[PDB]
UniProtKB/Swiss-Prot annotation:
The keyword Cell membrane applies. The chain holds residues 51 to 157 of 179 of the full protein. Residues 1-105 are annotated as: Globular. Disulfide bonds join 45-98, 59-93. Loss of cerebellar Purkinje cells and ataxia has been observed in mice with mutations that cause Prnd overexpression in the brain, suggesting that aberrant overexpression of Prnd causes neurotoxicity. This is Prion-like protein doppel. Detected in testis. Detected within seminiferous tubules, on round and elongated spermatids (at protein level). Not detected in brain (at protein level). Detected in testis, and at low levels in heart. Expression in brain is very low and barely detectable. Keywords: Amyloid, Cell membrane, Copper, Disulfide bond, Fertilization, Glycoprotein, GPI-anchor, Lipoprotein, Membrane, Metal-binding, Prion, Signal.
Length: 107
């Protein structure tokens, strides 16, 4: 299989979501949700030493690396799109959670 389905890759189902981006972003998303990813192909989970803060940050970084063309094309004019899109990418990255996560203990 070709490396198009690489860690960070968008999953565009075209499903409308419910997120408070802020007044302008809310209107923008409501009118343009078809363009956006509904999910993201990323699997940060490996072992209990990996934390949520680590995973969410790494997911954003993976998403950047995977979908460079999308961001590059849009950014230079589509300034509002980038803001709204990143807020949603973060929502997705925050949502995906590891089964092994537990209450760690250290001195």
């Amino acid at each position: 299989r070709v490396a198009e389905n690489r860690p960070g890759a968008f999953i565009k189902q075209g499903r409308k979501l419910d997120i408070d981006f802020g007044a302008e972003g809310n209107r923008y998303y409501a009118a343009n949700y078809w363009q956006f990813p509904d999910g993201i192909y990323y699997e940060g989970c490996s072992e209990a030493n990996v934390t949520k803060e680590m995973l969410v940050t790494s997911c954003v970084n993976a998403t950047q690396a995977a979908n460079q063309a999308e961001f590059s094309r849009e950014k230079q004019d589509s300034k509002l799109h980038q803001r709204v899109l990143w807020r949603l990418i973060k929502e997705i990255c925050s949502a995906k959670h590891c089964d092994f996560w537990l209450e760690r203990g250290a001195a």
